Ligand binder design. Structure first.
Ligand SMILES: [Ca+2]
Ligand SMILES: [Ca+2]
Ligand SMILES: [Ca+2]
Ligand SMILES: [Ca+2]
Ligand SMILES: [Ca+2]
Ligand SMILES: [Ca+2]
Ligand SMILES: [Ca+2]
Ligand SMILES: [Ca+2]
Ligand SMILES: [Ca+2]
Ligand SMILES: [Ca+2]
Ligand SMILES: [Ca+2]
Ligand SMILES: [Ca+2]
Ligand SMILES: [Ca+2]
Ligand SMILES: [Ca+2]
Ligand SMILES: [Ca+2]
Ligand SMILES: [Ca+2]
Ligand SMILES: [Cl-]
Ligand SMILES: [Cl-]
Length: 92
RNA sequence: GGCCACCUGACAGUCCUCUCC
RNA sequence: GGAGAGAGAAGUCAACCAGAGAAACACACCAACCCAUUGCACUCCGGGUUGGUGGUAUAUUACCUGGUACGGGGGAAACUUCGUGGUGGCCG
């Protein structure tokens, strides 16, 4: 898709608690640039995925290109740019 | 006076519907 | 959103008033487990089983304690003990 401030990540272990998941995600993604927020929900449709919103697109492209397949709670995570701007980015 | 089913009421943390703020 | 009024599921209960008073059943949350889900969101929220916890359910309907009204039976009397929402089928 088009490069975006937010990266879409799926194929995440569904047994992991939300706080635990957001925390690990920040730990392994913080190095690419400031992270504005990370949305994770365990609802039927949103479980196994998470949105990581970066402050700079350049930071999103870096994380995407460098963490594709990263081992994570026993599953190789899949990453893509989000199809649409996350609200906080669109509302600026 | 017992046991089972249906009747009919009392109770009305869910659900519906209507009015008011 | 709050309040209230109808309708009313589940479940328990039965003459009348009242004190005391559970349970059952719905519902909500949490945990474990099972099934389903590879899903593009930004207003929360899939189903199942087992267990735990919760509530102006701080209720009431059982159980108990007081009387009321009907009926019985017992007292010489001053009174006292029992019973109590409709049918059909098995039964006493
Ligand atoms: Ca964060
Ligand atoms: Ca959930
Ligand atoms: Ca008005
Ligand atoms: Ca009924
Ligand atoms: Ca009655
Ligand atoms: Ca009472
Ligand atoms: Ca009580
Ligand atoms: Ca709630
Ligand atoms: Ca609810
Ligand atoms: Ca699975
Ligand atoms: Ca699919
Ligand atoms: Ca939106
Ligand atoms: Ca579940
Ligand atoms: Ca469940
Ligand atoms: Ca209670
Ligand atoms: Ca009471
Ligand atoms: Cl969680
Ligand atoms: Cl979130």
């Amino acid at each position: 898709t088009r490069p975006n401030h937010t990266i879409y990540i799926n194929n995440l272990n569904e047994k992991i608690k939300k706080d635990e998941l957001k925390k690990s995600l920040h730990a392994i993604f913080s190095r690419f640039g400031q992270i504005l927020d990370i949305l994770v929900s365990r609802s039927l449709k949103m479980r196994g995925q998470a949105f990581v919103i970066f402050k700079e697109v350049s930071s999103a492209t870096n994380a995407l290109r460098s963490m594709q397949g990263f081992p994570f709670y026993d599953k190789p995570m899949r990453i893509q740019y989000a199809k649409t701007d996350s609200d906080i980015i669109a509302k600026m």
